[PDB]
Design a protein around this motif. Structure first.
Motif: not given
Ligand code: OB4
Ligand code: OB5
Lengths: 9, 227, 236, 10
Positions: C60, C65, C70, C73, D5, D8
């Motif tokens: 992050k 990035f 999402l 990522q 999920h 992050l």
């Protein structure tokens, strides 16, 4: 091996 | 010691000269095919390509300087990668398709995981407008690099391979400078091309894995090496 | 729409990457040298579990990035996580030739590698990578660039923003080599050398991932749910 | 619904 043979031809 | 005395233009010339022919498959449009016969066609094709690859490899500058055992190992490690990058190269001008042979052009409807990644790589080459002179450099790099870290105080063999590798890098840069790319653009494009090799390695490994999930005698032995 | 990453200078990019670097974690302080599949994988699963949490927060902080969706990522981290653990392992193992430093209190020789099957093969590949880095005199600044490249590249074909960020890191790499006094030829030769090693790191990861599945479909160590989900993203 | 999920996000 076959690969061995074909390489040294 | 010839490999290390070649100019960039002579290097390209030698590699283009060494290029194997594009072989035909035994695909018959009128015949119906099962998943078994389609794999049969590809196995027959790949098996015949290997014979030409071996002779091509011997014409790759520096390869014959290596011991026989090291030559076997490099080809054992890289044979699928080299087949794949060859497939991807001749499939560039056929978006959404892979040209296994001039008489064998397939879309994803007809392994589908590897197929997808091969299509993506082909699309990637097309977007970069990959040149033939760059392709032959890349393919030679794969042959020399893929097995170089998986070989007794021989280490001089490793050293010779790396020197040849550095030469192909010089050759690549030479080609990009010739095309009028700025110094920054050359380094960027070089990086872009070499990063693609990591993907090709990935495709090879996953290809093998899905296979262990009929073959020729030569292929079976090549396969043996990755197990 | 415009990414902050592409506005950074080469030195700013290096500083950002250096500052985002995760710490070197320890394993259990039991002085027992693992000489079994269970004890070995036991310590390693625990270590990598904790390392993953740091990796996710490290990623992050990698310039560019954050600009990704999402889902993108998640995809990149799922594809690259073992590669990133490996290059980290290889980097900190550099000054311990013939040995792999999984943790400062967990130093292993290949004699312990045998004690799972197919491990010693990966072990030698890792050792070769580390030895290769040592002979090249890989710098920390170069290392953090390579690790970020692995993150952004390994899942990119499975887009233009990532490629611009990747070009940015290439510029950064060359910048470091020029600062180190390397000639133009030495610069592009070294860049090529480093990037070709990434191919081998991918190879080791593909092989290693294959064994993490075997260990899972051996019911050996309790695998964490996070790991099981990171692992299943590579399923056929 | 992946743990990744959640991790992050912040
Ligand atoms: C999972 C099936 N695969 C596979 C097949 C055989 C094999 O080794 C014997 C390894 C992988 S795979 O990777 O998709 C593989 C790629 C692609 O389709 C499969 C395949 C192939 C290759 C050899 C075979 O005996 C069969 C199939 C391809 C191929 C063939 C020729 C060529 O010039 C380029 C590519
Ligand atoms: C030779 C070591 N290997 C292996 C197989 C055994 S291997 O594939 O590199 C790799 C898989 C396995 O061991 C290496 C490794 C690891 C862990 C932490 C770290 O920072 C770096 C690597 C492993 C590992 C990772 C996650 C797990 O849940 C268990 C094990």
């Amino acid at each position: 091996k076959i690969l061995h043979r074909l390489l040294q031809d | 010691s010839l490999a290390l005395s070649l100019t960039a233009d002579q290097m390209v010339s030698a590699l283009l000269d060494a290029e194997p022919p594009i072989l035909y498959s035994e695909y018959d449009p009128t015949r119906p095919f099962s998943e078994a016969s389609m794999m049969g066609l590809l196995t027959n094709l790949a098996d015949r390509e290997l014979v030409h690859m071996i002779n091509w490899a011997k014409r790759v500058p520096g390869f014959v300087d290596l011991t026989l055992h090291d030559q076997v190992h490099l080809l054992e490690c890289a044979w699928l990668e080299i087949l794949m990058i060859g497939l991807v190269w001749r499939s560039m001008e056929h978006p959404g398709k892979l040209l296994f042979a001039p008489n064998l052009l397939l879309d994803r409807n007809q392994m589908v995981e590897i197929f997808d990644m091969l299509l993506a790589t082909s699309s990637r080459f097309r977007m970069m407008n990959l040149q033939g002179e760059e392709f032959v450099c890349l393919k030679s790099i794969i042959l020399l690099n893929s097995g170089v870290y998986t070989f007794l105080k021989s280490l001089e063999e490793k050293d010779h391979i790396h020197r040849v590798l550095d030469k192909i890098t010089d050759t690549l840069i030479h080609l990009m400078a010739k095309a009028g790319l700025t110094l920054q653009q050359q380094h960027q494009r070089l990086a872009q091309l070499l990063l693609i090799l990591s993907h090709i390695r990935h495709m090879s490994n996953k290809g093998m894995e899905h296979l262990y999930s009929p073959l020729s005698d030569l292929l079976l032995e090549m396969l043996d090496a990755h197990r």
